[PDB]
Symmetry: C7
Subunit: 268 residues, 7 copies
C-alpha cells in the first residue's frame, strides 16, 4: 500500500513550491504511514484487564480508557496526534491556497504583459511603456506584502510545529503508559473491578519517532523559508519590482527572445 | 487513507467560493476523520457486561444500548453527531447550488455582453448602449436579492452551526457515560441481568474535540461572510450595478483591453 | 468514506432537474449513510441468548430471528427499510428516464428549429413559418400530457413516500423490540432453549431518524412539484405552446440575438 | 455502497432498449442488493449446534449443511438463487448481444443509405432508386425474422422467469428451515452429535421478497414486449419494410430535412 | 459486487469473436461467482474437530486436511478446480492471441489492398491486378492453415473441457467428504487425536453446479465451432481465397461502393 | 477477483514480445492466484498447539514457527516461494527494459531511415545511399550483440527457473511438515510446552502444483527462445544486417510501397 | 495484489533514470512485498502469554511489547525497518526531484537552442554563434556541479544504505527474539504476571531476507553510479561542455539532420 501512496508523489517560485510541497506533503505522508501501520497492528490502546474479565469486559476497559484520555496533558496529545499533524498540513497549505487566489491572478496578467512588451522590444530593435510601468511598481508595496504574508504565515506555522514537535517528542518517552480508572457511576462501587487499569498507548512509539523525523525536516526547512526573505539578494535593444524581477527569473524559461539575447550577451 | 482524502483537496467571487468551499469542505473533512478513526478503534460504544455474560450477551447490551439512546438529550446528539455535521455541510452547500442555477445563467450572459461592449469601446476609441444598460441595472434590485439570499442563508446556517456546536461542545464533557437498562419485555423480570449497564460512548471524545475545531473555524468564518454584505465598500475612451461592478472586478482577469488601459492610466 | 460519497454530489427545466435530483439523490444519500453506519456498528440485530449458549448458538438466534421477521407488521418494514427507500429512489427516477426517451428527442429538434428561425428573423430584420408552427402547437396537447405525466407520477410517488414515511416514523418508536421464538421443528421440544428470545433491531433508531429527515424534505418538495403545474403562471423585428414557451425561457441562455434584443428592448 | 451502484444507472428502438435494460438491469440490481445485505449480515445459514460444540464444531455443521443442501427441492433453489437470477440476466442479455452482431451491421448501412437518398430527394426537389429498394424490402422477410427472434427469445425468458419466480416465491414461505444430518461416514456412529441439526437459511426472507419485486416487474414487462409484436400498429417532393419504417421513425431525430418538411406539411 | 463484474461484460469474424468471448468469458465469470460466494461463506473446508480441541486445534485440522488433499483423485480436483477453469480460459484464449499476432497483420494489409482496388474499379467503371492477386491466393494454403489451427486448438480445448467437466461433474456428487488423518510425525502417537477427522469440502456443491452450466454451454459451443469449418458453405463493373472472401463478407460494412452496387444489383 | 486480474491480460519482434510477456506475465499470474487463494484460506501455517494453550498461545506457535523457518532447506523456500517467483518475473523483465533503453532508440531511427529511403526508391522508379548504409551494417556486430544479450539473459533466467522449479517441485512433496521447537530463552525451561510442535505449511500444496504449471510453460518456452538464435534461418526498382532484415520483416506492415510491390512481384 | 503492483512498473540520461528508478523503485517494491505478506500473516509480533491470560491479556502483552521495543538496539530497527527503507527511497528520490527543478529548466532551453542551431548549419550548408556559445560553456563549471551533486548525493545515500543493510542483515539473525517485561507501574507488583514474556518478531525473517536482496542490488548499483563520474570517458558542414555533449548524445534521437549526416559520414 505504501508504494501506492508514494508513487503518487514520485510519478509561483519552484523553491517556494518545494517548500510548500514538502511542508504539507511530509506530514501527510507521515500520517499515512502511522495509519498504514496502525491498521496492521490493529488497536491503538491496550489495558491489563483482569483475567476474570470477559473479552468485552476487557474491550470495554480499552475503549473506556481511550475516551477517558480527556478526563496528564501528554496523554491528550497522543490520542489526537494525527489530527495535530493534519492541522499543520492544512495550516501550511493555506498560504499557498490564499496565494493562488489573492496573488496569482494579478501576477499572471502582469507577467504576460511584461513578456509581450519584452518581445515587442526585441522584435522592434532587430527591425518604454513597460519600463514606466515597472518603475511604478518599484514605488508600490501592495504585492510584496501579499508574498511576505504567505512566507510569514508558513514560517510561523513551521515554528509552532517545531516547538510543538519538540515538546511532544521530549515528553513522549515518559508518557507511554497511564493509569485509567473506570470505576464511575454505578460501577464506582464494584469490588470485582480493580481501582485502576494500567493502559499503554501502542502508537506512541511510532508517533514519537515520526515526530523526530518531522522535527528534523522542519528544522532544515526553517532556514530555507528564511532565505526567501532576502529578496534583494535572490537580467541593450524590497520593492514590488524586486518581486516581479524574481518572478521574471523564474519565467525566463518562457522568454524565447531572452534566450537568444542571452547567448549574444554571453558572446559579447 | 487520510492522505488519499486530503490530496483531493490539495491537488462567483473567489472569496465567496473559498467561504463556501471551507464551510462545506471542513465538516466533510472532519466527518471523514472521525470515521477513519472510528473504523480504526472498531466500536462506537461499550457497556460493562457482567463477567457471566457471553460474548453475544455482552454484544447484545452494546447494540441494545446503542439503540436505547433514543428512549438525556445530549446522548441523542452523540449518536447522530456525524449526520448533524453532514446536515450542515448540505445546508451550507444549497446556497451555492441554488446560486448556480438561479443566478449563474443570468450573470454569464450579462458579463459577456458587458465585456464585448467594453472591447468594442476600446477598439473604436483607438480607431453608449452598454452604459444605458448598466444604468438601468442600477435601478434594478432583482439580482442583488439573489446574492443576498445566498449569503444570508449561509450566514444563518453558520450561526446555527456555531450555536449548535457550542451547546454540543459545552455539554459533551459531562455526557460521555450513561446508564442503560435492557430489562424490557420478558427480560425485565430476569434477575441474572443487572438493573442497568454502564455504557460509555467512545467517539464522544473525538467528536467533542472536532466540534471545537469546527466551532473556531466557523467563528472566524462569520465575519468573512459579514464582510460580503458591505458591497459598496467592496474601475476615458446597494444596487444590482454595484454587484455587477464587483463581478467585473473578479473578471478583470479576462479583460485584455482593460489590462492595457490600466497600464496607460497608471502611467498617466 | 462519507466525503468520498458527498464529493460526487458537490464536485429539461432546472427546477425540475433539482426536484428530480433531490428526490432521488436524497434517499440514496440516506441509504448510504445507514450502511456506512451499519458497517461501523457491525450487526443489524441482537438477541438475548442465554448465557449457556455458545457463540454460534447465540449467533443462530440472531440470524434466525432476522429471518423470522417475516413469520407485527412494522417489524417487516424495519428489515426491508433500505429497499423501500431504494424503491422510492427508482420510482422517482423513472419519470426522468421516461422523459429522456419520450420527450427529449421531440423537444430537442423543436427547440433548435425555433432558435434557428428566431435568428433568421433577427438577421433578416437588421438586413412567419415558425409563428404558424408555434400557433399550431398551441392547438396541440400531445407534449404537455407527456410533461404532466412525469410531474404527476413524481408527485404521486412523493405522496406515497410521505404517507409511508409518516406511518413508518410514527410507529417506529414502539417497534424496536420483538419477541422471537426459535422453537420450531425438532427444537420446538428442546427445554434448554427459552420459549422466546428478546431481540432488538439495532438500525431502527437510525432509520427512524432518517425517515424524519426524508419526510421533511419531501414535505417541502411537494409544493415545489405542485408549483410546476401552474404552467400559465410560470418574451418587434395550458397548451403545448405554453410548455414550449417555458422551455424557451430555460434556453434563453443559448439565444445570442435575444440577449442583444433584450438590451435594446430594455433601453427602449 | 448502494449509491455507488445506483449512481452508475442514474448518472435499436428506445422502448426495446429500455425493456432490455430493465430486464437485465433489474435482476443485477436485485442480486447486488442481496449480497450488499448478505455481507452486512455475515452468513447465509445457521444451525443449532449443541451447546457442547466448539466454535468450529458449530461452524462445521453450518458449512456442512450448506453443502448438504444438494443431498426438499426448494432448498436447492435457495442456495443457488443468485445464480439463477444471474442466469436470467445473461439469458435476457443474449438477444441484445446477438442483435448487435446479427442485425446492427445490416441496419446501420441500410438506414444511412435511406437517409442520404431522402436528403438527395429533398435537395433535388428544392433545386426513385431508394423507393425501388424499399419496395423490394417489403418483399423480404429476412431482417424481420431477426427482430422477431430477439423479442421472442426475450419474451420466452421472461415467461420462464415469471413462472420460476412464482414457483420460488410461493414455496419460499414454507422452506426457510430444514433438518440437516451430518452423521455421515465415521461420524455416523458418534453419539455426541444429534441425529439432525435444525438449520435455517438466513437469506431466504430477502430473496423471497426480492423475487416478488422481480416478478411484478416482469409481469408488467410481458405486455410491453408483446406490444412490440404489433409492428403494423406501431411518414411530396409484417414485412421488413414495416421494420425499416419503424426504425426510420426512431431515427427521425437525425433527419434534418424531414424536420423542415414536417413543419411545412403541418402548416399545409 | 456481481453487478460490478457483469456491467463490464454488458456495458476476425463476429461469430468467432463471440465463440472466443464466450469460451473465455464464461469460465472467468463462473470462477468469479465461486469466489464471490466463497468469500461470503468464509472457508472452503471444515473438519469435525473433537469438542476437546481448541479453536486453533480445530483450525489446524482444517488447514492440515486442506493441504493433505494431495497425499481419492477427485479430492485433488476439488482443491484446484478454479485453477483448472482458469487454465481452460487461458487455453481458449491462446488461439485468439496467437491469431492476433500471426494472422491479423497479414489480413489487415490484404483487406485494405482489396478494398482500395475494389473502390478503384467502382470509380473507374462509373468514369485486373487485384483479381490476379486473389486468383493466386486461391492457389495458396498458408493463411487458411493459420485459421484452421486457431479453430482446431479451440475445438480441442473445448472437447477436453467437456470431457473434464463430465468426469468432474459425474464424480462430484460422491466425493464431497473424505477422511483426513493428521496423525503424522510426532503426533502420529498422540492418543488425544482421533485416527481420522471427517472433513467436508464446502465449495464442491457450488463447483459441481457450475461445472454443469459450463458443460452445457461448451456442449452447445462445440457445433458452433464445427460450423466454422464448413468454409465453402459459409458477392459487373477450401482455399485461402475462400477465407479472404469470408473476411470480405465480414468487412462489407466498410465497402461504401459495394453498398451502392448492391442496391443497383438488387434493383436489376 | 480473478476475472478482474485476467481481464487486464485479455482486454521488438512479436514472438519476442510474446516470450517476454509470457515469461513475466505467467509467474505474476501464478503469484496472484496463490495470494487470492491464500487470503481465502486465511493462514499460511498451522501448528498443533496443545489443547491447554490459549488462542494466543496457539497463535504464538504459528507465528513463531513461521519465523523459525530460517533457524531443512526446502522449508526456507516454501516461506519465500512467492518472492522467488517475483524475482524470476523481474529478472525476465530486465532484458526487455534494458532492450527498451539500449536498443530501441537506435533501431527506431534506423528503421525510419530505411523505410523513407525505400519509399524514395519506389517513388523515383515509378517516376544507393541506403544500400551502402545497410552493407556497412553487415560489417557491424554492435547491435546484434545487444539482441543476443537480451535473449541470452532471458534464456539463462529461464534455465535457472526450470532447474529451481524442478528442485522445488520434486522436493515439495516431502517437506510439507516440519517439527518446530519454540523452547528458546526463558521458555526453553518451560515444561508445560511440548518439546516440538508439528507445524504444516498450508500453501505448499498450492505452490507445488503452481510450480509444475510454471515448469511446463518454461520448458516449452526454452525452445522458443532458442529458435530466436537461428537468425539466418528466421525481401528491382549472423550480422547486424540480418537483424535489421528481421526487423524489416516485422515492420513490413508499415511499408505501403512494399505491399504494392509485393502484389506486382507475386503477379510477375 | 502483487501483480496489480508490478503491472504498474511493467506496463536526463537513461542510465541515470534507470539508476534512480531502480534505487527508489526497488525499496518501494520491497516494502510493499513485506506489507502484502504482513497483512496475510496478520501480526508483526507474538508473546508467550501464560495460559491463564485471557485473549486481551495476551493481546495486551503483544501490543505492550511492541511499544516496549523503544525502552537491544537491533530491536528498535526491526520495528521501524519499513520506514528506514522508505527513508532511503525518499532520500534517493531527492536528487532527481532537485535535479528536475534546479537543472532541467536550464538544460531544456540550452539543448533546444543547440539543436536549432545545428539544423540551421545543416540547412545552410546544403543551401558560428552556437560554437562560440558552447566554447564558453567549456569554461563554465556551474551546471556540472549540479550534476555532480545529484550523483554524489545518490551515491552517498547508497553507501549509507549498503552499510545500514549490512549491519541490519548481519545482526538480524541473532535478534529475532527478546524478553519483554510488562511489570510496570501498579502491575510491577502483580505476581500473576511472569517477570518477562518471551516475544518474537514475526517479520524479521522476511525483512532480513529482503535486506539481502536490497543489499545486493545496491552493491551492484554502486559501480554504475561511479561510472557516471567518468564523464570524459562517457560527434564538416570535466567541463560543462562535456556534460552538454553527453546530453547531446542522449538527444541524438531528436536530431533529424544528424541522422542523415551520420549515414553520409559512415559512407564517407
Amino acid at each position: 500500500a505504501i508504494a501506492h501512496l508514494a508513487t503518487e508523489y514520485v510519478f509561483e517560485l519552484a523553491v517556494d513550491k518545494m517548500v510548500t510541497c514538502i511542508a504539507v506533503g511530509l506530514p501527510l505522508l507521515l500520517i499515512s504511514l502511522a495509519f498504514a501501520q496502525e491498521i496492521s497492528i490493529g488497536t491503538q490502546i491496550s489495558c491489563f484487564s483482569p483475567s476474570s474479565f470477559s473479552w468485552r469486559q476487557a474491550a470495554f476497559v480499552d475503549s473506556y480508557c481511550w475516551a477517558a484520555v480527556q478526563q496528564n496533558l501528554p496523554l491528550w496529545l497522543h490520542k489526537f496526534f494525527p489530527y495535530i499533524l493534519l492541522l499543520f498540513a492544512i495550516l501550511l497549505y493555506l498560504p499557498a491556497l490564499f496565494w493562488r487566489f489573492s496573488a496569482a491572478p494579478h501576477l499572471c496578467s502582469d507577467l504576460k504583459f511584461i513578456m509581450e512588451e519584452l518581445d515587442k522590444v526585441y522584435n522592434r530593435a532587430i527591425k518604454p511603456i513597460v519600463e514606466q510601468y515597472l518603475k511604478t511598481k518599484k514605488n508600490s508595496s501592495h504585492l510584496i506584502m501579499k508574498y511576505i504574508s504567505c512566507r510569514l504565515v508558513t514560517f510561523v506555522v513551521i515554528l509552532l510545529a517545531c516547538i510543538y514537535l519538540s515538546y511532544y517528542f521530549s515528553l513522549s518517552s515518559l508518557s507511554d503508559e497511564f493509569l485509567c480508572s473506570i470505576k464511575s457511576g454505578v460501577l464506582k462501587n464494584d469490588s470485582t473491578i480493580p481501582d485502576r487499569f494500567q493502559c499503554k498507548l501502542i502508537a506512541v512509539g511510532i508517533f514519537q519517532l515520526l515526530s523526530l523525523i518531522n522535527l528534523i525536516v522542519y528544522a532544515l526547512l526553517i532556514p530555507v523559508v528564511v532565505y526567501t526573505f532576502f529578496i534583494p539578494f535572490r537580467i541593450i535593444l524590497y520593492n514590488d519590482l524586486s518581486l516581479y524581477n524574481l518572478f521574471l527569473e523564474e519565467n525566463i524559461s518562457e522568454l524565447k527572445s531572452y534566450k537568444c539575447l542571452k547567448v549574444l550577451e554571453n558572446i559579447k
